[PDB]
Nucleic acid binder design. Sequence first.
RNA 1: AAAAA
Length: 519
Amino acid sequence: KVFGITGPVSTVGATAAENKLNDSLIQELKKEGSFETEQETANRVQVLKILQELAQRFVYEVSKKKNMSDGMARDAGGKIFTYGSYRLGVHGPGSDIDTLVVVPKHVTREDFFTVFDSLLRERKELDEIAPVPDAFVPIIKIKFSGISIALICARLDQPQVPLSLTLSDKNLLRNLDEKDLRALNGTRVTDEILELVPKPNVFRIALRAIKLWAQRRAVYANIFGFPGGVAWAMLVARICQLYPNACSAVILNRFFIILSEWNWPQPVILKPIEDGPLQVRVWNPKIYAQDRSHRMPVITPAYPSMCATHNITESTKKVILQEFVRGVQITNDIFSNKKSWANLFEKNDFFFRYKFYLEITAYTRGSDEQHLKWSGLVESKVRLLVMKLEVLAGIKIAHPFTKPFESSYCCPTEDDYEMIQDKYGSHKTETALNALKLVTDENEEESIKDAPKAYLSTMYIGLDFNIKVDIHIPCTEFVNLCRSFNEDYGDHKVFNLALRFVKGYDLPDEVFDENEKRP
RNA sequence: AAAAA
Ligand SMILES: Nc1ncnc2c1ncn2[C@@H]1O[C@H](COP(=O)(O)OP(=O)(O)OP(=O)(O)O)[C@@H](O)[C@H]1O
Ligand SMILES: [Mg+2]
């Protein structure tokens, strides 16, 4: 049993004391809501039934539009595969379902963003929709029967996709567009990770703990330059390979030690990187300057191997490492009977730890869908601002928080919209925004539900200075950069973007939870 | 072609 590219660090098995801490770890995971209910799971499976119905109808309808016979259009098939954390079996109650739609050659992504998009919109169950056709991997994001779904589409080079099709055959990848290869590899990567760990259930528990920890410590969000689900999965998988007989609790301790001691940017790799024909691009820092720039590379096992942490910046690297060091101290303390699992999973203090914050607000006076598009675009560029800021001589760190803050306002007139852009983002002025603000208290209320809305999504970057530092160049670049995608958001009567420098004590109330109090 | 699954 060779798992991975080296032998194990240790084949020593778990002691009674370690197994006791493993039992306690699992109980803390349960208490903290790591595992969804049976009903919640049933709800996911029901969505998957509908998505398959839609996928096949999608392929049939496209086929017919391309003048194929009734019988041939049916034979074209189409199917779905899960991928991501639900397929891996480490999802929680709040996790999305990642769904890959596999379609034959005559069905393209333009079809996906027109016909399949159309089919989703017919559904009474559709709560939200935000198509993102221009992304490294194009996606339709939806909320369906209250469940977040991520939908991507891979076009195979064959006339038919039978329901029985599997993705094991590497021949299926021949000559495929880069975007489709990435799509198919969502599913293939999950399956290979499970193949590459000595004890899948030890791996699953350890990963559930790392997902909870990373969420709590605010080091989980691919979009903002932190590792996402697959990067965290592969990191845990590597530790599992190195300690094949350890319990999950011990894997956590070793995870923090090994990854804090790791000689970054040496890559984390789960299996020898497969060579392909010269037509196919594989992660290789010797050939590609871009790959050489990856700060903490975590490489997917599925051919062709890619880096799952391209978005990591100098600042987010420093934060991840700080958190690993904390993990070492706390897990050691847990194993020496001084601390609890609860201590490890304690919430971050992002909004207490810096003197200064840069506040980024995307405004939309329009539909919820328009706001999802605009705010999604802006959110996707925040890491670019982080990178521009962190290279400025006077900046010690530019630390992005991992989730936007959403709010909406009743906004009957053009003048009201201009007022909202004035008063928001400062605790000094934020009380004046009410009572236009929508709350879970009065949202049911006919006047509130019926009113035109202005929507806000606000992101924060924590700032620490090497010292006033002039930050106008990165900020102005960012403002202008977002505007040009392309002319879709140039209308200032509907879309706006504002950046605000804010000191810690003037941070909005939204930022602090019930248990917490303003500095 | 500034890597939103
Ligand atoms: N940056 C990336 N590099 C490589 N593959 C990725 C990347 N981001 C997403 N994926 C693929 O898409 C899948 C789903 O992405 P998603 O962001 O939903 O993460 P996940 O693993 O499902 O975890 P969770 O949804 O619980 O946060 C991943 O598991 C992975 O296979
Ligand atoms: Mg997911």
